[PDB]
Paper text:
Four distinct clones (AU1, GU1, JU1, and UU1) were obtained based on changes in the CDR regions.
The crystals of scFv AU1 in the apo form and as a complex with the extended U1 peptide were obtained. The complex of scFv AU1 and the extended U1 peptide epitope was successfully crystallized using 0.2 M ammonium citrate dibasic buffer at pH 5.2 containing 20 % PEG 1000 at 20 °C. The diffraction data were collected at 2.8 and 3.4 Å resolutions for apo form and scFv AU1 in complex with extended U1 peptide, respectively. Apo form of scFv AU1, crystallized in the P42212 space group with two molecules of scFv in the asymmetric unit. The two monomers of scFv in the unliganded dimer are related through a pseudo-two-fold axis with identical CDRs facing each other. All the scFvs superimpose with RMSD ranging from 0.358 Å to 0.498 Å. Interestingly, no significant conformational differences could be observed in CDR conformations.
Numbering used by the authors: 3 to 117, 134 to 243
The structure:
Amino acid sequence: EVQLLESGGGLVQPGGSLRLSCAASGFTFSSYAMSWVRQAPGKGLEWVSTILQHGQRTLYADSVKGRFTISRDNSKNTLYLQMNSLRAEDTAVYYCAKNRAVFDYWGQGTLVTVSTDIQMTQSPSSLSASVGDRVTITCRASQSISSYLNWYQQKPGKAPKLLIYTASTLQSGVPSRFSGSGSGTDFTLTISSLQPEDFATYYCQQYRQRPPTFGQGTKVEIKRA
């Protein structure tokens, strides 16, 4: 089984520094690029950084350029994010993810507390439904992204899980009631019959352009009493 274990999160003062670590097992660590994606409290997913297979090249998001440094030790199968000059905006749960575009495995995340791109828009923002219902989520892109569109499921209290990649291809182990379709700028994720485990927040992510960008997400919750 594939395992990603983050550590290093904690409370720090603004301007301070932290070092996050990710321990990987169950796959050839050196064969893949590794990324950090963060989620601010009550907000959506945001790609932070990516490092290539042998540490040759690194990419950063504009908000962290100059303050963050990603590194890896392929002998220790470990990934590092050195966060310097921390700000209040940096407060978030930081996730360790495999790959650079299609994040097929995620760690559980570590919480860090501080005392021109393609825009993806999801609709609805939230929706209340019941078991057995049919749910349809729409993801729209500011410019054409062909079919380079992924869908992630994030159950409450859990890390994101890859559902669909390249618009319509189901990930191994995903139930058939999930289906994805669309092209260009307009995409849909459909759950044909809701099950109690399907109540979660769903995110769409484009990897047509670097950096990859996410939608705000769609919360699918049970109908309140």
